[PDB]
Design a protein around this ligand. Structure first.
Ligand code: CDL
Ligand code: CDL
Ligand code: 3PH
Ligand code: HEC
Ligand code: HEM
Ligand code: HEM
Ligand code: HEM
Ligand code: HEM
Ligand code: UQ5
Ligand code: UQ5
Ligand code: UQ5
Ligand code: UQ5
Lengths: 68, 70, 48, 59, 122, 243, 376, 376
């Protein structure tokens, strides 16, 4: 395969993002539900981790296919 | 050295008048099945208890992590 | 077996147990251990 | 059924002082063969990745 | 306790018969009996009961133990014709051992010890 | 807590993972060049010497020329003073700071750790290193980052003091390999994985020989065990007991 | 005849060559020879490593690294020592579980079981102080957490803690005295092993049938030397795999960071072979009660030859309860490696209670019922 | 009996309480128990010392100084461990001279004598490599002079020398391995001592009369416990005097200078108990011949039960010759601390020749003449 001077990883990560639409919906639901917070402790790190774990598991073997 | 009263006839053959490992291939599946027949109940109750308690604990730990979310 | 088998076989009777005088004289070694520890550490204000 | 030869027994097996040097030369050659097989398999599998492959490539 | 301990004995007897059935099925393949499972090294009363026996009974007990240990080394069981003849519950030791233990219980109520010790080697 | 644990890293198909596989020594060479130009401004690697790179990564003359471009403090001379000299093969890799306190002072209080054993010193070592280097993502909702800190969900706690350092084309490889950020990260991760386990190839070759030899010896010992026990396993006992 | 002329030939012949042994011993009777071989391996590789280790807080980690990279065969020796400790604990734990399954501690072998429990306690202390020697993060912080259990003793707790440390914290005198104690305790283990083996030779071994075996005895040297060689080669295979292919599999990555007394790790855990004791300690929310529970576990281990009834295959109720005990101790091993959590606290408490129930209630009482079932 | 039911109590009773001993043993039979007490004292003091010693160059001297001035009771421990080696060698030398005087190695006690000679060799090696550890001028230069004497074996010389050093000169690897070897060797000394005592118990001890004493034997544990305690109290008095009043009397002042590989001291002499071997080596003007003579002395020591005829009194010619041998050995001890001079070279050569003459000519031939005179 042809190796590119530009970074292929953001494009591959964007490609796997339709495969994890459910986790993205859960994260956006969390982000909407803590919008009116005032205590500064509400966060959505767990659903964010779920979405990025799904995307990472998709994109991991396709990232090293494009690298020497 | 601990005299034992006993009445018997004992026979023994030279180890160079019989085979060494040829019967080991014939008896190997039978010995496998006999081992699992003899130790089946204990290994099963060990596996059931260990994996059931571990699975229940891991499930409730995951529920505990989910309960901390916002 | 000698520990609990002897209790279960009925071999431990009051007539076979040590006497109360024997238990008094054996248990007097407890004061020896206390005074030995006090001699070793000397952790007192007892001398005055 | 299968049985060790008598003439081969009388030469390399009847005395320990003849058996032991034969044992040592057989041990030497067995180690050489095992070394050769392991090294050949490793170099064949990992061809193009070793340092010597890069050095011989730059010649 | 006496009101419920009148009928707690048949349940004990049923459990004991089931236990002896299972273990005697296990024992009969080795040609053993229930009394062969008692070790003179493990118990000094059994060591005392064994020297109160006639010599042919001791010779038979040693023969059965030797056959069972040989079978255990060979990873074998008895053949079917021998296995159908096995009597795992034919006692040869329980009467003598019960007498020995009753004598030891009798001596202990009067403060006396047993007139024997453990088997000591070396 | 999940946020304190951080995001786990996926399992990448490294070419050296199997017990039959060697390192990619071309990637070690390209990984060292990322170390010299990007890493070594703030990371020490104090247990490496130029002598250990010979035969793995460079020839003797290349490593000598690399070491001779560094300034190494030496002494004392006959006048009891400290001077500088050219580095040699026995010299260790230069440290960017003299001590931990100036390293903390140059980096907002955080000490950039030594990278000789950072691969074996982290759980899921190479995968965590690669995902940390290529993983400076946007923070999720409700997570704010103070000044001097940057978000990285692979770092435990999510707030790291190391900024984004790998950029496209920021290293000019000498073998013609195009240097994207991911290629640079993969090469430096390979070099760090070599740094934690420098003798992995030799260990695996010795392990293959040992496993083969012991597996043959198990069969020979089983043969000699069964030969000795044969007069007992086939003995005939006849007695008068029937039961 | 020639061994009749020298004492040392006679003792060796009697106890190694012509010693009678039951002919039906299976491969569960190989744990003792393997444990002795692993002790000899640990002593040899430790003596060889001591020629390059420096017991000072400024040079300990650096000398470990220098031994790893620059000393010829130093990586083999260091990995062999660190993984031979784990294989030593595997072999000893399987040996103890064999004794628990067969009831081998019973009369006339109470001395063998008691010297075994003494050996196991010395082994635990030896491994714990050996782990501090690399002076990594786990090495520092585990020694800090465990030696801080002495303050659970009232009045004189902190004084004993400071006396063991040599100061107000774990520092260089702790490392130096730990190095001396660690060099010393394996020789006590060798002496204890010689005494333990000579205690067993008074009466002999038990057999898998659980019956008296004096009618069927064969020589040890001709027959069980080869049978022990087979198991030694199976152990050497696992040893080779662990040394060469997965050397940090049974370790922790935090012990490759140098020790820092001002930043603790997030998950301080011991080696795997101390995890069940650690789970017993963590399950109880009281330090004194946890230390007492560990002491009561070891007291119940000492009291096994006098409260335990019930043995091998023909005693079937205790034979079935053995597997429940084994599942309980492996659940304790798994629970020690996990973080503190209400469900893990509850499950650890229940598992500790079941271990005490099995040791102190099942072994006397169920053993007595099955003796009454079989011979009443 | 209570000791008849536990096998540990039976062995201890048989070999320490009820062991039959001749009743006419004088105070020259207390050498062995004193040697065992000194071995135990050295082991205890050293294990305590190793908790404050660092076995690295540029830390060893400073760690010994920190031990001396900052560790509570550390000066007592160091001076006790230093002078205990001297007292250990005094006691063992007097023990060997007792055995030489009475012919104690003869039939049937040849194994006792041989195991004693092995113990003496291990003691010499242990004391030498322990003397290297403080890393002073005497330590470094004695280790240099002795280990660079393997260049006398042809061809395979400097290869063995450089493998011993771990380099090209005595440096940090040599000190680091000497620490491990020195820690380890006293446990071999303790095991060899146990074997040595067990070899004597097969036949029991000789008596000052030199006759069979089976008719007049008494219990060890009552009669020879207090008799050993008296001699132990004398040894404790001498030990306390040496530690508290003259702690540096038996040493060398040059060992209080830190080691310098580029500057050598004017006079390089070992400790006093090595001086007779040093005089034998230094008297012969050839290195290989000196090493051959040193080996021949110990070979003649091993061959003594098979060539030595003649015991204590009632064998009066060999009894008188013993005092010439004692004077010869003490002269060799005095000559080793002097400088190399033609008269001292001549006298040392004559003393070495007479030592070999007594060990190899007087003991067989004069002993045979005595037997022909007495019973011929
Ligand atoms: C593979 C699948 C894995 C799962 C199944 C495990 C094995 C299946 C059978 C199990 C069994 O009962 O094992 C004993 C079984 C037969 O036992 P048995 O005869 O009933 O009773 C003997 C005792 O049980 C045994 O006592 P023994 O001392 O008399 O026999 C010693 C020796 C028996 O000696 C042998 O014959 C073994 C030979 C070793 C092979 C090495 C070859 C390399 C070098 C060759 C050199 C040989 C020199 C000889 C040349 C001369 C030949 C003329 O056995 C061994 O030590 C070998 C390993 C046996 C099982 C160990 C693993 C158990 C746990 C399972 C873990 C797996 C997950 O022996 C074997 O397994 C060997 C035959 C190979 C089986 C393959 C399938 C055959 C169809
Ligand atoms: C691992 C330690 C156990 C090795 C057992 C020693 C043995 O019988 O040699 C097997 C084995 C020799 O291989 P092999 O040719 O199959 O056995 C020689 C004949 O089959 C049969 O040779 P053999 O019946 O004449 O063997 C009698 C054995 C004398 O055997 C004994 O008295 C054994 C005493 C110690 C038992 C260790 C158990 C743990 O003396 C020797 O020939 C070997 C002396 C070295 C010990 O020992 C080795 O050299 C293997 C490495 C072990 C180190
Ligand atoms: C949320 C997080 C998700 C995590 C997902 C991964 C979890 C671990 C992987 C999956 C494990 C499950 C299958 C494990 C099979 C292992 C082999 C085995 O068991 O064989 C041994 C054993 C083999 O016997 P042998 O061959 O005779 O040795 O097999 C058995 O005897 C059967 C064991 C069945 C008992 C365990 C069943 C699973 C427990 C789940 C309990 C859930 C409770 C829910 C309560 C709350 C409800 C609201
Ligand atoms: C701007 C200076 C700087 C540069 C250049 C730099 N680092 Fe970092 N690095 C840091 C700091 C500061 C930390 C510690 C941050 C913290 O612990 O919060 C760190 C931490 C790390 C860690 C460990 C993170 C952890 O979880 O412990 C690794 C691995 C690492 N750096 C590798 C690299 C690599 C690879 C490069 C080159 C691409 C590099 N560093 C370049 C400053 C730097
Ligand atoms: C005479 C015998 C022994 C000596 C001289 C010795 C010496 C040493 C030394 C110097 C170290 C530090 C070097 C290093 O960390 O790699 C060490 C580590 C260690 N030793 Fe030993 N040892 C001996 C026996 C034992 C025994 C019997 C055990 C039993 C379990 C043991 C367990 C350990 C452990 C767990 C470590 C830590 C290994 C690590 O994680 O790096 N040692 N030993
Ligand atoms: C360094 C540790 C140990 C060594 C070298 C060792 C050695 C041995 C050996 C060689 C045997 C004879 C054969 C065998 O059963 O394998 C034996 C038997 C035995 N050991 Fe161990 N052992 C050790 C630890 C232990 C421990 C920790 C225990 C128990 C807590 C123990 C309890 C026993 C018992 C009860 C027996 C007799 C079993 C029987 O013969 O049926 N040992 N030991
Ligand atoms: C640490 C070193 C030693 C210890 C602990 C030791 C211990 C003993 C003991 C306790 C005795 C019995 C009591 C006595 O006669 O003193 C004895 C006797 C003896 N020892 Fe030593 N000894 C040591 C060194 C030596 C050496 C170096 C030699 C000879 C080269 C030797 C040769 C003998 C002989 C021949 C006897 C028998 C004396 C007789 O019964 O007449 N021993 N030893
Ligand atoms: C387990 C036993 C022993 C241990 C751990 C041990 C330990 C040590 C240590 C750590 C040192 C260096 C510190 C210092 O010199 O003050 C030392 C020095 C020394 N050792 Fe020991 N030792 C033991 C037994 C012995 C024995 C049995 C002998 C004599 C036969 C001996 C003779 C010496 C000598 C002569 C020195 C030199 C002391 C000096 O001049 O300062 N050691 N030992
Ligand atoms: C039927 O049952 C039996 C077994 O089971 C099948 C056995 O296996 C054995 C044989 C026992 C073995 C192999 C175990 C090893 C024994 C011990 C005591 C282990 C401890 C010993 C060590 C570590 C020796 C190392 C120390 C040394 C050499 C001293 C230091 C000196 C130098 C380095 C020079 C016996 C007798 C037995 O009856
Ligand atoms: C990473 O680290 C860690 C360890 O390590 C590997 C551990 O094990 C443990 C936990 C282990 C437990 C609970 C079992 C072992 C327990 C103890 C108390 C070990 C015994 C050691 C003690 C008390 C140290 C004192 C040393 C002495 C007394 C020296 C011996 C000398 C003489 C008796 C004279 C933890 C938590 C740990 O996080
Ligand atoms: C001033 O100079 C001198 C010294 O210095 C202070 C001396 O001491 C000595 C005294 C030494 C003599 C007579 C020789 C000592 C004996 C031997 C065998 C040499 C020691 C050998 C070594 C160190 C080889 C390495 C082996 C080690 C460390 C242990 C081996 C292990 C086992 C046996 C298990 C003399 C003469 C000397 O003039
Ligand atoms: C000719 O007649 C005889 C003598 O002449 C009158 C003797 O003298 C002796 C031997 C004397 C002995 C055995 C006593 C002297 C002491 C020795 C050898 C050892 C010294 C030990 C001491 C003081 C205590 C050591 C303490 C401990 C705790 C170490 C043990 C370690 C552990 C338990 C782990 C014998 C046999 C004899 O026949």
């Amino acid at each position: 395969v042809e190796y590119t001077e530009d970074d292929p990883k953001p494009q591959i990560e964007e490609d796997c993002k339709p495969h994890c639409v459910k986790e993205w919906a859960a994260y956006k639901a969390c982000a909407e539900r803590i919008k009116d917070d005032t205590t500064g402790q509400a966060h959505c790190s767990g659903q964010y981790f779920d979405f990025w774990k799904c995307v990472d598991h998709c994109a991991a073997p396709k990232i090293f296919a494009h690298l020497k | 050295r601990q005299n034992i009263p006993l009445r018997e006839i004992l026979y023994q053959l030279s180890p160079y008048q019989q085979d060494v490992i040829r019967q080991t291939f014939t008896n190997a599946p039978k010995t496998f099945l006999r081992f699992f027949k003899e130790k089946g109940v204990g290994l099963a109750t060990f596996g059931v208890l260990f994996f059931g308690i571990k699975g229940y604990t891991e499930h409730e730990m995951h529920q505990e992590r989910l309960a901390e979310r916002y | 077996p000698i520990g609990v088998w002897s209790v279960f076989q009925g071999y431990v009777t009051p007539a076979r147990l040590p006497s109360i005088q024997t238990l008094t004289r054996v248990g007097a070694w407890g004061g020896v251990v206390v005074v030995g520890g006090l001699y070793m550490v000397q952790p007192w204000d007892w001398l005055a | 059924v299968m049985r060790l030869s008598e003439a081969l027994y009388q030469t390399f097996f009847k005395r320990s002082t003849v058996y032991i040097p034969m044992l040592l030369v057989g041990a030497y050659f067995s180690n050489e063969a095992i070394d050769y097989a392991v090294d050949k398999m490793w170099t064949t599998r990992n061809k193009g990745k070793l340092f010597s492959d890069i050095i011989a490539e730059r010649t | 306790t006496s009101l419920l301990k009148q009928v707690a004995l048949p349940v004990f007897n049923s459990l004991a018969t089931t236990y002896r059935s299972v273990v005697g099925a296990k024992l009969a393949k080795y040609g053993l009996r229930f009394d062969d499972l008692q070790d003179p090294l493990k118990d000094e009363d059994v060591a005392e009961a064994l020297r109160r026996l006639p010599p042919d009974v001791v010779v038979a007990r040693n023969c059965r133990l030797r056959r069972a240990l040989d079978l255990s080394c060979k990873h074998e069981a008895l053949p079917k014709d021998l296995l159908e003849k096995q009597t795992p519950e034919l006692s040869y030791l329980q009467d003598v051992l019960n007498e020995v233990r009753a004598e030891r219980r009798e001596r202990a109520q009067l403060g006396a010890p047993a007139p024997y010790t453990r088997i000591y080697y070396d | 807590n999940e946020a304190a644990d951080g995001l786990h890293a996926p399992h990448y198909p490294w070419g050296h993972e199997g017990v039959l596989d060697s390192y990619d020594h071309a990637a070690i060479r390209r990984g060292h060049k990322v170390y010299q130009q990007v890493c070594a401004a703030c990371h020490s690697m104090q247990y490496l010497h130029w002598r250990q790179l010979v035969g793995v990564c460079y020839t003797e003359e290349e490593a000598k020329a690399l070491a001779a471009e560094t300034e190494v403090e030496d002494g004392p001379n006959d006048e009891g003073e400290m001077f500088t000299r050219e580095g040699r093969l026995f010299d260790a890799f230069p440290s960017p700071y003299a001590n931990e306190q100036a390293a903390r002072y140059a980096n907002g209080g955080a000490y950039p750790p030594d990278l000789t054993l950072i691969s074996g010193g982290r759980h899921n070592g190479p995968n965590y290193i690669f995902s940390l280097l290529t993983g400076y993502r946007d923070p999720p909702a409700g997570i704010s980052i103070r000044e001097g800190l940057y978000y990285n969900p692979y770092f435990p706690g999510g707030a790291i003091a190391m900024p984004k350092m790998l950029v496209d084309g920021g290293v000019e490889y000498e073998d013609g390999t195009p240097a994207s950020a991911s290629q640079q990260a993969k090469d430096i991760t390979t070099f760090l994985a070599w740094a934690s386990y420098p003798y992995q190839d030799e260990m695996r070759v010795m392990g293959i020989k040992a496993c083969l030899m012991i597996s043959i010896l198990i069969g020979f010992a089983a043969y000699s065990k069964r030969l000795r026990w044969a007069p007992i396993k086939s003995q005939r006992i006849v007695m008068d007991v029937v039961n | 005849r020639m061994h009749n002329k020298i004492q040392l030939l006679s003792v060796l012949n009697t106890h190694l060559v012509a010693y009678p042994t039951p002919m039906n011993l299976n491969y569960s009777w190989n744990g003792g020879s393997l444990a002795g071989m692993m002790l000899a391996s640990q002593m040899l590789t430790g003596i060889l490593l001591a020629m390059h280790y420096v017991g000072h807080v400024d040079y300990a980690f650096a000398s470990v690294q220098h031994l790893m990279t620059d000393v010829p065969s130093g990586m083999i020796l260091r990995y062999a020592h660190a993984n031979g400790a784990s294989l030593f604990f595997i072999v000893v734990y399987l040996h103890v579980l064999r004794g628990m399954y067969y009831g081998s501690g019973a009369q006339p072998r109470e001395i063998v079981w008691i010297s075994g429990v003494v050996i196991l306690l010395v082994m635990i202390i030896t491994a714990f102080i050996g782990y501090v020697l690399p002076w990594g993060q786990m090495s520092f912080w585990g020694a800090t957490v465990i030696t801080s259990l002495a303050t659970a003793i009232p009045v004189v707790g902190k004084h004993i803690m400071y006396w063991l440390w040599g100061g107000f914290s774990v520092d260089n005198p702790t490392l130096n005295r730990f190095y001396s104690f660690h060099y010393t305790l394996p020789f006590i283990l060798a002496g204890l092993s010689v005494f333990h083996i000579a205690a067993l030779h008074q009466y002999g071994s038990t057999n898998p049938l659980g019956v008296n075996s004096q009618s069927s005895l064969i020589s040890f040297g001709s027959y069980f030397g080869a049978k022990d060689l087979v198991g030694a080669l199976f152990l050497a295979l696992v040893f080779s795999i662990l040394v060469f292919f997965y050397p940090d599999l049974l370790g922790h990555p935090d012990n490759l960071i140098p020790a820092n007394p001002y930043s603790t790790p997030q998950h301080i855990v011991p080696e795997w072979y101390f995890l069940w004791v650690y789970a017993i300690l963590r399950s109880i929310p009281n330090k004194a009660m946890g230390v007492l529970a560990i002491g009561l576990v070891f007291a119940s281990l000492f009291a096994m030859p006098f409260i335990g009834l019930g043995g091998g295959k023909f005693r079937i109720i205790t034979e079935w309860l053995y597997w429940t005990f084994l599942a309980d101790v492996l659940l304790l091993t798994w629970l020690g490696g996990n973080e503190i959590t209400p469900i893990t606290s509850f499950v650890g408490q229940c598992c500790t209670a079941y271990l005490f129930f099995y040791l102190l209630v099942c072994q006397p009482l169920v053993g007595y019922l099955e003796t009454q079932f079989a011979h009443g």
